[PDB]
Amino acid sequence: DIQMIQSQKFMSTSVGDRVTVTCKASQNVGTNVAWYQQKPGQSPNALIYSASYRYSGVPDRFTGSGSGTDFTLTITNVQSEDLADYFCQQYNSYPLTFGTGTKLDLKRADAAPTVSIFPPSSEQLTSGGASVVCFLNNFYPKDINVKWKIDGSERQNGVLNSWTDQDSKDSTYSMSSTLTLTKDEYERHNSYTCEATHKTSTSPIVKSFNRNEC
């Protein structure tokens, strides 16, 4: 019955700055509060115990505070490796309950996407399949549009577009765009193009190949 409320689903900051994650308990929980860090594709890592004590091994820039019902995780010197979800937990009374989490994102300068295009593999072809792939790498901000054109006509059906989590090293994003086709349709047309339009250019970033060649 004790609810831990993390009212901020999202927090933003810049490298070097501070960030403050808040957690509101519905009843008093003294200082029986723990904080956890969860990086993408990792299990949670225990950060703070007893509201304010840091685990052996944890950087000094993580500070927890509070008592009763209001609890705070402060990260004073945010590095790019600090991208993660952070969540509180109470172990004052049963059942153990957790807040719903706050995800940190980092601000950085705008940056343009590097584009690579890949024709269907031979293995895929002998299997009866045809996918064409474009990687748009290391851009910022997140927002980006990709268009596929086959011999100059837009194709929308069959396109899967997927963003990575924010990059732990440079705070950029990357994106994969896959155009899925039948083998027969693929072997009938020639010119395959992905066009990425991103804020950092009024002109589309383009990569293309011809099947009849390459």
């Binding site: 029986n32 723990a34 937990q89 172990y91 059942p95 890949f118 997927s162 990575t164 896959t178 899925t180």
Partner: protein, 218 residues
């Protein structure tokens, strides 16, 4: 890894699932074992706890009726069984622990087991190499990749050169197309290394117990 959790599993609707969690060293009985659930939209939810010393348990009342927690001290293993599964039970399940004396909070978390409740069949991934071709050299760097297509359920882990190249790696989350998942992975290497310094992607799909390695051909 102190807490070794069983692999991702597909479970049919209404059947049971039994997960395992193996503890390391000679420290099994120094801890309470806890199970925690995460449905990728929601938050963490505490399921239950067990005492390995005698087998005593405690539960979140929400989960108690369909959950059985046991232990094997001889093999130092904790087990959680859940019965009558629905789609709402599809989630990742963590094995965790905290000191037997005081509840620090959870000091170590296992890697977690993604359980998918679905009537569908298990389908292993086809792995396709993404080698650089007609594309321009892209400067002094070359980006390679692997397309992982037609698998069910989640998830897959893609690694490059058996764990080696793991700073230049981008991992794209899987999407559904025709009931099946597709994801991709890319790695960037200096272009001067390409032909002879070979590059291989290794794709594990726990749920179908399949591992496919694919050498990228020059």
């Amino acid at each position: 890894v102190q807490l070794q959790q069983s692999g991702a599993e597909l479970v049919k609707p209404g059947a049971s699932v039994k997960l395992s969690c193996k503890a390391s060293g000679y420290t099994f009985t120094n801890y309470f074992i806890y199970w925690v659930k995460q449905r990728p939209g929601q938050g963490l939810e505490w399921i239950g706890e067990i005492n390995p010393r005698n087998g005593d348990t405690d539960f979140n009342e929400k989960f108690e009726s369909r959950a059985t927690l046991t232990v094997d001290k001889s093999s130092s293993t904790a087990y959680m069984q859940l019965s009558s599964l629905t789609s709402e039970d599809s989630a990742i399940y963590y094995c965790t622990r905290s000191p037997y004396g005081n509840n620090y909070g959870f000091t170590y978390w296992g890697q977690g087991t993604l359980v998918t409740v679905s009537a569908a069949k298990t389908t292993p991934p086809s792995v396709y190499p993404l080698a650089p071709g007609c594309g321009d050299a892209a400067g002094s760097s070359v980006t390679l990749g692997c397309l992982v297509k037609g698998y069910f359920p989640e998830s897959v882990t893609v690694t490059w050169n058996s764990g080696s190249l793991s700073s230049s790696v981008h991992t794209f989350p899987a999407l559904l197309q025709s009931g099946l998942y597709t994801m991709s992975s890319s790695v960037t290497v200096p272009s001067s290394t390409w032909p002879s310094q070979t590059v291989t992607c290794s794709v594990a799909h726990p749920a179908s117990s399949t591992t496919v390695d694919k050498k990228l051909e020059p």
